Amino acid sequence: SPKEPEQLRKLFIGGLSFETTDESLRSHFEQWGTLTDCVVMRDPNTKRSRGFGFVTYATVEEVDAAMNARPHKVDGRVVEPKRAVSREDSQRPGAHLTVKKIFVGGIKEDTEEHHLRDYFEQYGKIEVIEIMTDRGSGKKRGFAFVTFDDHDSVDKIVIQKYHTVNGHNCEVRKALSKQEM
Amino acid sequence: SPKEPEQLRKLFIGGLSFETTDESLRSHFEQWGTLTDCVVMRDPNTKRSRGFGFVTYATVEEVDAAMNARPHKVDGRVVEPKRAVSREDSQRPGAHLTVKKIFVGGIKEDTEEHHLRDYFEQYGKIEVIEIMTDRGSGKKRGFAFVTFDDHDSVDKIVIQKYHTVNGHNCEVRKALSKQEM
RNA sequence: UUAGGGUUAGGG
RNA sequence: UUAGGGUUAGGG
């Protein structure tokens, strides 16, 4: 009886201690809901832990409640849980990078800070809003950077590439530095 | 009449818009106290802005109140203020890197999380505390990583290299990744 | 079309 | 002496 989809309910649990089994991974994350699925990824030959796994709750509400419980110490080790990234986007560069900033392209020269603030507040607490303009000329360049205080907010946004802000169909990507491009 | 030293009262203001003068830099940061010193660094020949400057309050209280006002938009641009780093440490690698994690070496096999928590809480809100141990052997390795929610907390700590925690003289350095060493 | 200015570490 | 395990992205 699961209404919400699987990917929205799934969490990638990276950095798992090599002592973590399916059972010890389940016995930890079950404190924040019921687990539809809980697996520790292993090598097909050695069956040794590959250092990451997946958990899937019945509700996305439980997924958010799980993320509200960071940090997570499973089997005596701090793990890094991340919202599940599609097998599509996982091939794209920087999809797995933990960032607190996003790229917003297509705002089209009439979008100000309050437009971004009023829209993106619904995903998390906003730190900075930078409307990119051409220096000296003052012309707006049609894209902006929004920085949140929590990386999980960014991860919830970029799974939906397209957003309609201020009457524009915009693209939202994870903010990559110049040295990662 | 300045009791506290100069370096503790000085802030490095990086990323300054090239339109920022001493006066516009002062007219912004004077909202959080009195400015002992306020300079925009320029090239000796062109006198064009080098993109950074310094401000110095009369109290470190005003310096903390200034940092509580992040982000700072000076002359229509978000600037990155940092606690002043000695001309010594500025030669050391990674001193200017904005990090939220610290290295703590010398805790010596009898220091647990609560020892680090009770000591380092006095500098800011703590996110994670990782006591580094040898896998499989369980032996403690004598160093730890402490992650704060604010980079400014880390910057206030690492200006004092040596700290006495749990009866040990420990070294505190900025957490550098493996790829920056 | 929609990728940032890391000259963003010292003048006195 | 006091530098981290980025095999931390898919099994079904």
Residue numbers in the entry:
A (entry chain A), B (entry chain A): 6 to 186
Paper excerpt:
Heterogeneous nuclear ribonucleoproteins (hnRNPs) are RNA-binding proteins associated with complex and diverse biological processes. hnRNPA1 can recognize both TERRA and telomeric DNA. hnRNPA1 comprises an N-terminal UP1 domain (residues 14–184, tandemly linked RRM1 and RRM2) and a C-terminal intrinsic disorder domain that contains an RGG box and a nuclear localization sequence (residues 196–372).
To understand how UP1 interacts with telomeric RNA, the crystal structure of the UP1–TERRA complex was solved at a resolution of 2.80 Å. Overall, two strands of (UUAGGG)2 RNA bind with two UP1 molecules in the complex structure. The two RNA molecules are antiparallel, i.e. each 5′ terminus is located close to RRM2 of one UP1 monomer, while the 3′ terminus is located near RRM1 of the other UP1 monomer. RRM1 of UP1 always binds with the 3′ end of TERRA or the 5′ end of telomeric DNA, while RRM2 of UP1 binds with the 5′ terminus of TERRA or the 3′ terminus of telomeric DNA. A9, G10, and G12 of RNA combine with Arg55, Val90, Arg92, and Ser95 from RRM1, creating a hydrogen network to strengthen UP1–TERRA interactions. The side chain of Lys113 donates two hydrogen bonds to the phosphate group of U2, and the side chain of Arg146 forms two hydrogen bonds with the phosphate group of G4. By aligning and comparing the structures of UP1–TERRA and UP1–telomeric ssDNA, we found that most of the interactions between the UP1 residues and nucleic acids are shared, except that Arg82 from RRM1 and Lys113 from RRM2 only interact with RNA fragment, while Gln12 from RRM1 and Glu147 from RRM2 only have contacts with DNA. As expected, when we mutated both RRMs of UP1 (D42R/R146A), the mutant could not bind to RNA at all.
